[PDB]
Amino acid sequence: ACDYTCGSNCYSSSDVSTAQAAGYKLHEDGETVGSNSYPHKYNNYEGFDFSVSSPYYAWPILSSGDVYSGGSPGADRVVFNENNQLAGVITHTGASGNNFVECT
Ligand SMILES: Nc1nc2c(ncn2[C@@H]2O[C@H](CO)[C@@H](O)[C@H]2OP(=O)(O)O)c(=O)[nH]1
Ligand code: NA
């Protein structure tokens, strides 16, 4: 099912729970993967109205269905907090520069 669309990529609630679980376990272990070092803090410069407390972390979510393991992160991210509550799914597709737009 298409529960969120980021650009032309569709992701399901399960796709999002899977991606977040991976991201949170690395957060907890205090290790990172890939050159841009994920998970990394999400600052919320954009000011999205998340309904979970900060701080937030971003972890890539991929349209191929695989869990990020370094390599190309694409434009999409699952965002979660320190308590492992999901905050939102965001993407760089449809925004200029390094900005983000929320997946809908
Ligand atoms: N637009 C934007 N980027 C952020 C924020 N917090 C961290 N970043 C990361 O900061 C980078 C630019 O300095 C953005 O591409 C993005 O990287 P990632 O997409 O790899 O997660 C934020 O609040 N807004
Ligand atoms: Na992708």
- Residue numbers of the domain that contains 8: 1-104
Nearest Cα to 34, choosing from 20, 23, 45, 18? 23
Nearest Cα residue to atom 7 of ligand 1: 42
> What CATH number should be reported for the domain holding residue 87?
3.10.450.30
Ligand 1: which of 41, 42, 79 to mutate, most ligand atoms within 8 Å of CB? 42
CA distance 71 to 18: 18
Cα–Cα distance, 100 to 43 (Å, whole number): 11
Q: What is the resolution of this structure in A?
A: 1.9
DSSP assignment string, 44-56: -TT----SSPSPE
- What is the number of domains present in the chain? 1
